[model samples]
Target: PQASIDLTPQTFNEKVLQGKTHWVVDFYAPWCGPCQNFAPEFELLARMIKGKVRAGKVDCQAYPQTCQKAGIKAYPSVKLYQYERAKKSIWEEQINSRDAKTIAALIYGKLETL
Candidate 1:
C-alpha cells in the first residue's frame, strides 16, 4: 500500500500521543523541494513497516502550529516515537538520508531496543 496517514493539529494528539503503537512521523513542507522529493520515500517506508509500526505525515506548510509545537526547525523532520506522554518525555531521529531502507532500519533499531 502506497499510503501513509495524514496527521494534523486535529489528529496528532490521539494518533501519536503516548500509544503502545509506535509511529514514524514525517513532519514536512509541501513547498520544500527536498521534502517534495522525499514524500514517496516516506510512503514506501510506511508500507514496509505496515504491521509493526505506524506512519504519519504532518504538512508543516499547511499546519504551521503543529510543527512549531513539535519543535521542528526545518523543512523535513523525521521522528521515531516511543512516546512517554504520561511521563511527559520524548525522543527523536533527525535522519540525514531520505531513503526508506535507512529509515526502516532506524525504526527497527529503536523498536528492538524497547
Candidate 2:
C-alpha cells in the first residue's frame, strides 16, 4: 500500500504551491526514529484522504533545498498547506498525535469550507 508521495526539491513547486490540491506534508529524515514510527500512519492517512487532500513526505536529508523553502527546522516536522483559489494559501503547523485517524481528522478540521 502506498503511504505518501516522495517529494523532492525539483518537484516541490509544482506539486505543492502551484497545484490546487491541499497538502499535508511530513518533513523527515531517514535516520530519525520518530519519522520511522510515523511512516505507516502517514501512509494510512494518505489513503484515507485520497481525493480531498494529498499527503506526502519530503526527505530533508536528501532534499535540503525543499525543506528549507518550506521552513522545516526539525525532524518529523508536519505542516498543512491549504491552497486557496484566487487568494493567499494557508500554512499551518500541525500539533497532534501521529496516528492515522488523528491526522486525518485534523486535516478535515483544518480544511476551510468552500
Per-residue CA lDDT of candidate 2, range 9-101, in tens? 766677887677788888899999999998887888889988888887899999988888778788788788887777766555665567779
The models' CA-based lDDT, in order, is 0.80, 0.80
Q: Name the regions of candidate 2 deviating beyond 4 angstroms.
A: 86-92
How good is model 1 by TM-score?
0.85
lDDT of 2: 0.80
TM-score of each: 0.85, 0.86
Q: What's the C-alpha lDDT at position 102 in model 2?
A: 82
> How far in Å is the alpha carbon of 58 misplaced in model 2?
0.5
List residue ranges in candidate 1 displaced over 4 A. Answer: 83-92
